[PDB]
Amino acid sequence: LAFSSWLFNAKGQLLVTRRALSKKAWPGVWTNSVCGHPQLGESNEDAVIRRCRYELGVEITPPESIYPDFRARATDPSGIVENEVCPVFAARTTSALQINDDEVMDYQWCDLADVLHGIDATPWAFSPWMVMQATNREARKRLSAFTQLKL
Ligand SMILES: [Mg+2]
Numbered sequence: 001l002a003f004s005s006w007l008f009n010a011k012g013q014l015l016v017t018r019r020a021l022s023k024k025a026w027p028g029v030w031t032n033s034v035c036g037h038p039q040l041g042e043s044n045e046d047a048v049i050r051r052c053r054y055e056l057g058v059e060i061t062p063p064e065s066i067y068p069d070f071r072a073r074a075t076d077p078s079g080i081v082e083n084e085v086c087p088v089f090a091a092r093t094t095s096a097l098q099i100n101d102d103e104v105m106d107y108q109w110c111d112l113a114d115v116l117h118g119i120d121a122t123p124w125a126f127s128p129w130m131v132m133q134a135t136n137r138e139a140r141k142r143l144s145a146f147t148q149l150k151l
Pocket of ligand 1: 035036051055103
């Protein structure tokens with residue numbers, strides 16, 4: 001049971017993050033903005049809001065559900081197996097990042113189209129869930145909606 005979220009700023013840029021060197025699974029790997037696990041009795045929406053605060057010190061708009069049926073298994077460079085129920089969301093940040101370096105060792109604000117081109121060309125350089133989520137046609141169209149400038 002898990003969630004993933006793709007965050008955009010009001011200008012429509014996508015935030016990509018790099019998992020800290022100390023993460024158990026996929027340490028050091030570039031990936032979409034945030035992922036995690038809801039707590040007992042917590043909605044996925046509220047888990048997203050909570051983890052964005054926790055890993056990125058940031059506030060967000062109401063998370064939109066963009067890939068509710070996403071579920072996968074993937075094995076990490078060290079063999080850690082992960083099998084997850086992981087509905088995907090998108091939101092916009094409404095405040096500045098304040099980075100938790102226990103979780104995130106780097107990040108970049110990027111153009112979605114560049115990120116998609118990188119994912120499509122060199123998927124091995126990104127976490128496997130970032131790639132499997134972004135290559136879903138419907139989810140990808142939702143990411144594109146979040147690139148619009150919001151004034
Ligand atoms: Mg996380």
